[PDB]
Scaffold this active site. Structure first.
Site, PDB file in Angstrom:
ATOM      1  N   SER A  97       0.891  -1.235  -0.411  1.00 26.06           N
ATOM      2  CA  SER A  97       0.226   0.157  -0.320  1.00 26.06           C
ATOM      3  C   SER A  97       0.665   1.714  -0.503  1.00 26.06           C
ATOM      4  CB  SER A  97      -1.354  -0.392   1.068  1.00 26.06           C
ATOM      5  OG  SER A  97      -1.696  -0.871   1.102  1.00 26.06           O
ATOM      6  N   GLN A 144     -10.825  -4.864  -0.317  1.00 26.03           N
ATOM      7  CA  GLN A 144     -10.074  -4.934  -2.094  1.00 26.03           C
ATOM      8  C   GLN A 144     -11.118  -5.589  -2.415  1.00 26.03           C
ATOM      9  OE1 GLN A 144      -7.157  -5.974  -1.610  1.00 26.03           O
ATOM     10  NE2 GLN A 144      -6.784  -6.499   0.963  1.00 26.03           N
ATOM     11  N   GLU A 166      -0.696   9.122   5.656  1.00 26.78           N
ATOM     12  CA  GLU A 166      -1.264   9.881   6.469  1.00 26.78           C
ATOM     13  C   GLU A 166      -1.266  10.921   7.637  1.00 26.78           C
ATOM     14  OE1 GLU A 166      -1.418   5.901   8.839  1.00 26.78           O
ATOM     15  OE2 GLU A 166      -2.590   5.143   6.812  1.00 26.78           O
ATOM     16  N   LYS A 214       2.963   5.959   6.453  1.00 27.40           N
ATOM     17  CA  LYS A 214       2.610   4.988   5.366  1.00 27.40           C
ATOM     18  C   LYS A 214       2.617   3.745   5.773  1.00 27.40           C
ATOM     19  CE  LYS A 214      -1.160   3.896   3.305  1.00 27.40           C
ATOM     20  NZ  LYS A 214      -1.275   2.680   3.967  1.00 27.40           N
ATOM     21  N   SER A 263       2.028  -3.750   3.220  1.00 24.74           N
ATOM     22  CA  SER A 263       2.534  -4.328   2.852  1.00 24.74           C
ATOM     23  C   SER A 263       1.669  -5.536   1.859  1.00 24.74           C
ATOM     24  CB  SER A 263       1.226  -5.816   4.304  1.00 24.74           C
ATOM     25  OG  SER A 263       2.201  -5.348   5.414  1.00 24.74           O
ATOM     26  N   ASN A 284      -8.764  -0.945  -1.312  1.00 20.88           N
ATOM     27  CA  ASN A 284      -8.124  -0.556  -2.865  1.00 20.88           C
ATOM     28  C   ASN A 284      -8.358  -0.403  -4.067  1.00 20.88           C
ATOM     29  OD1 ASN A 284      -5.443  -1.209  -1.478  1.00 20.88           O
ATOM     30  ND2 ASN A 284      -5.312  -3.320  -0.969  1.00 20.88           N
ATOM     31  N   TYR A 310     -11.037   2.736   4.315  1.00 18.27           N
ATOM     32  CA  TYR A 310      -9.806   2.194   3.401  1.00 18.27           C
ATOM     33  C   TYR A 310      -9.932   1.071   2.758  1.00 18.27           C
ATOM     34  CZ  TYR A 310      -4.897   1.809   3.192  1.00 18.27           C
ATOM     35  OH  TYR A 310      -3.697   1.201   3.193  1.00 18.27           O
ATOM     36  N   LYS A 357       0.036   3.646  -2.799  1.00 19.13           N
ATOM     37  CA  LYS A 357      -1.287   4.756  -2.792  1.00 19.13           C
ATOM     38  C   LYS A 357      -0.071   5.909  -2.767  1.00 19.13           C
ATOM     39  CE  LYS A 357      -4.521   1.855  -0.670  1.00 19.13           C
ATOM     40  NZ  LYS A 357      -3.111   0.488  -0.886  1.00 19.13           N
TER      41      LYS A 357
END
Length: 360
Positions: A64, A120, A273, A313, A316, A152, A150, A67
């Site tokens: 992630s 997801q 963040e 941030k 994984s 994806n 949150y 992002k």
């Protein structure tokens, strides 16, 4: 007296190196940048079976943390006039016109507030047509913009739209425009054959070698980037010193630093963040709590616009872990890359210990 590079290496040894034995992690890279000086620390093996040491050329999956590059690409396209964050996705992906998701604006996609996008893509969503169908069959649940979940697919749609607005595929947006603007030399959406010798194996929780493979093409903006420790230190440098870069990528970086709303002590910026600095350890841990990561949460407008702030941030994949953090007014940041997942809380705690103990 002990030289600074040794003091930083000792702090990384004290706080990150024990994680290798504790979690049976084959390989780790940790980098610190302080006052534009870079310190690189490599541990263990990128491939256990090849006895190949982790080094400055080792490529890791960012998960992630990808992002953050999508966010930067969005900031780039916005300040180039190619998109407005008030636009809706059907302006660019015309097949989404006259669908419920065309009520959601690009900023709400990028910051997870559409109101009905889960973490997801469903496993069965693999082809471009299945992704189109997934978004066409989207209906609003919560009021748009009210709740952060949150997601994806949410930021994947944002990245696809950014790419459409720039008239190139997303992999090309990053590899031909954004990575070069940031001075990254070994960052990839698709690792080329000439670099496969440098692409670490990931290791699953049985310490078997694996590598990221799944998801539709439009998931790449959410978790499809690979990079090296030198490249991620350069990316932190760019975030600490945007004024050193050309206007377009400077404005893009600054766009990713702008907090958009809050959930408790966490400011959601674009990708990053954001937190008031100094941040308590628990503030940083809370950002990665089950409540914040896995559940919907009502967002509130920013009240205190923090002058002094910090950003982080986690990321994984099945076989890799990443953590990046930087603190503009301390001129400091840190990157951790592993080829086995370790708990996010350990990454945050170890980085907190190192950064707070480095001498100013």
């Amino acid at each position: 007296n002990t030289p600074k590079d040794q003091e930083i290496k000792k702090l990384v040894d004290q706080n990150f190196k024990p994680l290798l034995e504790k979690y049976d992690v084959p390989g780790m890279a940790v980098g610190v940048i302080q006052n534009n000086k870079k310190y690189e620390m490599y541990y263990g093996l990128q491939s256990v079976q090849d006895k190949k040491a982790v080094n400055s050329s080792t490529i890791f999956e960012l998960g992630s943390v990808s992002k953050l590059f999508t966010a930067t690409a969005g900031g780039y396209a916005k300040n180039k006039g190619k998109i407005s964050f008030d636009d809706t996705p059907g302006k660019y992906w015309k097949e989404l016109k006259n669908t419920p998701i065309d009520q959601v604006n690009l900023l709400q996609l990028a910051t997870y507030t559409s109101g009905n996008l889960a973490l997801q893509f469903p496993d069965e969503v693999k082809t471009d047509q299945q992704v189109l169908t997934f978004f066409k069959d989207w209906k609003p649940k919560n009021s748009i913009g009210e709740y952060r979940q949150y997601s994806n697919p949410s930021i994947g749609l944002f990245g696809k739209v950014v790419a459409l607005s720039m008239n190139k595929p997303f992999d090309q947006v990053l590899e031909k425009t954004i990575f070069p603007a940031l001075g990254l030399k070994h960052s990839y959406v698709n690792v080329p054959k000439t670099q496969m010798q440098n692409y670490a194996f990931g290791y699953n929780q049985e310490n078997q070698p694996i590598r990221v493979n799944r998801g539709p093409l439009d998931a790449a903006p959410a978790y499809g980037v690979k990079s090296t420790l030198p490249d991620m230190l350069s990316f932190i440098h760019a975030n600490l010193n945007p004024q050193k870069y050309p206007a377009d990528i400077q404005r893009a970086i600054n766009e990713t630093h702008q907090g958009r709303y809050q959930v408790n002590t966490m400011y959601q910026a674009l990708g990053w963040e954001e937190f008031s600095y100094p941040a308590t350890l628990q503030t940083l841990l809370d950002s990665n709590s089950e409540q914040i990561v896995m559940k919907p949460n009502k967002v509130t407008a920013i009240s205190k616009e923090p002058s002094v702030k910090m950003y982080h941030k986690t990321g994984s994949t099945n076989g890799f872990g990443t953590y990046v953090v930087f603190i503009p007014k301390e001129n400091i940041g840190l990157v951790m890359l592993t080829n086995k997942r370790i708990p996010n809380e350990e990454r945050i705690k170890a980085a907190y210990a190192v950064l707070n103990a480095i001498k100013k």
